[PDB]
Every structure is written in C-alpha cells, then in structure tokens.
RNA sequence: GCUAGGCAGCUCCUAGCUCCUUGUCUCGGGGAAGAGUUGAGAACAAAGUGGCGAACGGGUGAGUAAGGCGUGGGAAUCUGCCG
C-alpha cells in the first residue's frame, strides 16, 4: 500500500485532509460492515450447530 | 465508547505495553473488559524487532463499534484489519549507519 | 530616498541662491534613488526658479520613470516645454512619450524635434519619431520593411527599435506569418542589424509556432546572437531560449545556460532560468539557480537576477524569502526586491 | 465592513428579487426570495433560489445563509 | 534563509538563530538534523521542540515564513 | 501576454491570472498631500453569549456491623458520547 505524497503545494493540506475524512472513514466503515456480516455468519453457524 | 487501547504493564525504564478493550472514563490501568494478548515494544535478538498482538476478537469489538487511538493503529494496520494511518505522509531524510 | 529628495531641497529652493538650487538638484539626481509626485512638483518649482532646464528635464524623465506619467490624462505642457528647453532632444522625446502614453499630444513630437534642432541628435529624433509612431498605435508590414531599410541606411539599432516597439505594441505586425517574417527579416538583413535582428529573430522564431521550433531554429537564433557580438545580447538569446523550451533536452539546456556571462547579462540569465523553469515544471531549477549564485557569487548580476525572479511571481514566495534572506545585493536594489518578494507573497499568498 | 442586510436594504422594495454570490466564484449564486428583518436594519432572514453562473436551478424556498457574516458585496 | 525562517519560528530562539549562523549553518541541514545534534548546541528543550516542530511544518511546506 | 469590466462616443481605460471621492493646494485640465470610508489581508480583543468537560482522572478510611462487600441472579427502568 502507498498512502504518501501529502505535502505538495504551499499551504493546501486539504488534500490529505479529504484523504483522512472520506478515505479513512469509508475505509473503516467498510471493514466494519464486513465484520458485522461475517461474525453474524459465525453466529448462525453456531445455531445450526 | 469502548476504546481498544494500550496500557503500560511493566518495570520502570523498560516498559511493556498491553492491548485491552477498556472504557473511556476508566483509568489507564483501570477496570478492563479483557486484555487482547500483548505488544512488547522492545527490539529483540531472535528476530531483532518487536512482537505481539492477538486477533479473532478485535473483529468483534470493531464491529460492535470501538473507536480506538492511533498509537493502536500503529499495530492494527501493521497486522492488517485496518487501512494504513492516514498520517503516513513523509519520512525523515538522512539516516546514517557505519557498524 | 525621496525623504532625501524632499530634504535639502527646501534649502535648494529658498536658499536665495540659484547656485544652491542647481547644486542640490544635481546632488539629488546623483543620489539617484528618488522620483515621485513630490519629485515632479518640487523639482518643477525649483527648476523654473533656478533656470536649469537640463536638470529640470532630467528630473522630469525620472518622474516619468518612477511616478505617474500616464495615470489618467497626465498633461505636461510647460513641463514638456522645459524638458525640451534643456535642448536635449533625448529627454524631450522621453517626456513626450510620457505625456503621449497619457493621451494624444503632437506638441510632444514638436518640442522633441525643436530640441532635436537644438542639440543635433539624429538618434534622439529617431526615438522621438518612435514615440510618435507608438502613440499612433498602428503597424503594417510594407512600411515596416521600409522603416527597417531606413534604420539600415542609418546603420544603427535606434530606428530599428523604433519600428520594433511600433509593431509589437500596435499588435498588427505579422498576423501569424512565416514568409512575411522572412521578408521583414530580409529588410533587417539589409542592415545586418546585429542586436535588433538577433533579439527579434529569437522572439519571432520562438514565440508560439511557425511550423515547429527545432534545434536548427534555436541554434540559428543563437548564431545570429553570436554574430551580434554583445554579452548582454548573449544573455538575451539565452533568455529567449528560456522563454521558449529548448533545442535538444533539459540537461543540455542547463549545461548551456550554466556559462555565466559578464555584468548586465548573468542577471537576466538566472532570472529567466528561474521564471522559465517555474513555468515549465517547478521552481526546482530556480533553486538550482540560487545554488549557482550561492556558489559563484555574481553579486550585482545575481542580485538583479533574484530581484527579477521576485517580480516573476512563481509559486515559491516564502521560498525565495528563505533563499534570499541570506544573500547579497548592490546599491538601490534590495528594498524593492524583498518588498516585491513579499508582494509575490501578496500575489500567491 | 458590509453585510447581507447591509447590501440588500439599499435596494428599493427591499430589493427582494435579485441574485447574489461570493465575488470570487462566478460559478454559483443564490437569489433573494423575501427579507424578514429583526430590528435596526442589520439582521434579516430569507430564502432564495440557486443561480449557478446565472443559471437558475432551485425550486422551493430555501434559507439564505451567512446573512450576518461581514464580508458581502452585491451582484450587478 | 536562517534569519527570516528563524525570526519566523519566533522570538524564542533570538540567540539560537546566531548560534546556528556562526557555526556551519544551513536551511535543509536543519530539517535533516536531529535531537542530540541540536542539544550539543546547548539550546534548551522548548526551543528545540519549537525548532523541530516548525521544521517538520516547513519540510511539508505548511510553514513558509514571511516577516509580517 | 492574455481576458473580463467600468468610462465616455467596437473604442477608451479598470481589475485579474500566466508567466478610493471630494475638497484645498498646486501643477498644466491633472496632479499633491490629506481626511474619511468603499474595496480587501490577517490577528484575538476585552470578554461574553455559547458548546463541552470540570460527576473523569487523583487523595483519605472518620464513619458503615451490612441500606455495605464478594458471589449468583432479576425485572419494574433509564443508558451523552460509540457503532
């Protein structure tokens, strides 16, 4: 993974800021969704057991 | 807000962190829900590096919605389950070695 | 400064001595760093009193150099009369072009030519006709080639620069032509026109495109510049090659523009390197140019260089600040230079 | 030192039906629907219609904002 | 430019400017230099802290000093 | 150099990115210092109004002989922040 090249132009950190906000939030949210579904899968397996 | 976090766990001047799912307004060493393994931050000799974490439950607690702190991202990305830190921007220039 | 132009000039005026007034006006033009609205007004009064129309015309040309000479209507009728009553046709035409750039004025050309009859200056009458044509603001290629052959017959750059300003200001000069550029270049070759043909051939051959700017064309403008035999002109050819991209590649470009020429030349060399490179990719090669100056130390040359780079207004304002806060400069440059660096911070930042 | 009410109340009939934008983006603007002032002529809430580069696109009365921020100038 | 960059980092290093000036001196050498390097220079801890702070800021470009 | 906008009959001048009005004084119908308020560059400023937290985290064990504590539960409830 490459997540570099944040400082490029004089005084416009909003690049990596947009990165942070949308990129990272949506990343973690996606991961969390996955986790919800997969773990509830595990649970229903335990019930079938 | 369950803050999956890292509390100091050791002798003076040579510590050893530990991974525990806490509560926010609980003390640093306070009432934990459960530890989650360990993370020794000391460089070693077998593989002269650091060690330590656990898996298979950080999934569950992330799913139920823990917002942890970035000194824990420094591990929960280095072992997967996360994206890299969105503050991995640059690197100090000029490291020099001669041994 | 102009604090000093308003200082001791009160004594010049009311000293009861026209000698004192004349000596002090010479002292002010010798300190040579002051020209403002105060200069125009006080010098007008003191010179009409002291009867030195020569120093009057000098201060008027300096007031046009660093003050409003074409602000809104900017008439100078008696002031132009004095600027030509110095009898210096040069200063006459200079004040004339000032009031002309303000608005229409034919007494401008008339006083210029009367001072020309007073001083016997062919080049100065050439420049007065230059101001006339430029304030007329019209251009055509037939009369352009005729005037090029006229300056050819005179065998000097003066009326060639007259026609150059006339056309490249009137903005109907070639109308995107190549063989017509060849016809005007033939009119100029009838002079052999060392400096003028070198510079204007560079500009025409590298402006936007005729067919494609190639190695032959770039080195050809460079060959005309070489036959021109002038150091500042060599820097002018380098700067035009910098305005255009290059001939072969950027490595050869830098290794050719790294041959420093004498004074009045390395200034525009480094400044054009900075501006051109910042226009092409980045101020990277401009920082390399600050490295060239920090190695070789062409003091006044690189001083005016970094000052022109400060007025170039690239994207590195505080960067030129942290590159020029530890530097050198000659007299009467650094104030405007660094204030215009912060002004470039007022452009971008 | 001028505000949104400071630039509206100039206009007669409270100048209720003209655009206005932020003078560095010729790309968006909001129209005025109708002003409702608080007291002493400095403060007033209203609605409008969006005019991106003079192109109307809004459909229902939506509040105008920043109506107290002291940075405004009119649209001509 | 040690003078302006520094009198931009503030009037706290009103002597460490010159203590960097008389010695080797450099603007990028600052960015690349480090803790014990600057401590050998006798500069106190909060001065060092602000130094490396603003220095990281400029290495990113977010500093860009200007005498205002 | 190149492009979008007031000024006074497509031209004559005002504001922008690539690479300021009028009145006194004084100069020449336009400029020269000069006051005051339209056109922008930013700083907290007293504070406040506010939002949040000061209920956490620290200290002690007088009291409390179990309305407490440990251990195991439950229903009759709530649960900012997190998801």
UniProtKB/Swiss-Prot annotation, chain B:
- What keywords does the record list, in alphabetical order? Chloroplast, Mitochondrion, Plastid, Ribonucleoprotein, Ribosomal protein, Transit peptide
Q: Which residues form a coiled coil?
A: none
| Chief place of localization | mitochondrion
Which cellular components does GO assign to this protein? chloroplast; mitochondrion; plastid; ribonucleoprotein complex; ribosome
Q: Which compartments does it reside in?
A: Mitochondrion; Plastid, Chloroplast
Expressing tissues: Expressed at low levels in flowers, and, to a lower extent, in leaves, stems and roots.
Is Hydrolase one of the keywords UniProt gives this record? no
Q: Name one GO molecular function term.
A: structural constituent of ribosome
One GO BP on record is: translation
Which segment is the transit peptide? 1-6
Q: Please report which protein family the annotation says this sequence is part of.
A: Belongs to the bacterial ribosomal protein bS16 family.
**What more does the record tell us?**
This is the only bS16 protein that is targeted to mitochondria.
Q: Self-association or partners: how does it assemble?
A: Component of the mitochondrial ribosome small subunit.
Its recorded name reads Small ribosomal subunit protein bS16m/bS16c
Species this protein is from: Arabidopsis thaliana
Specify first residue, last residue and whole-protein length for the fragment: 2 to 100 of 135
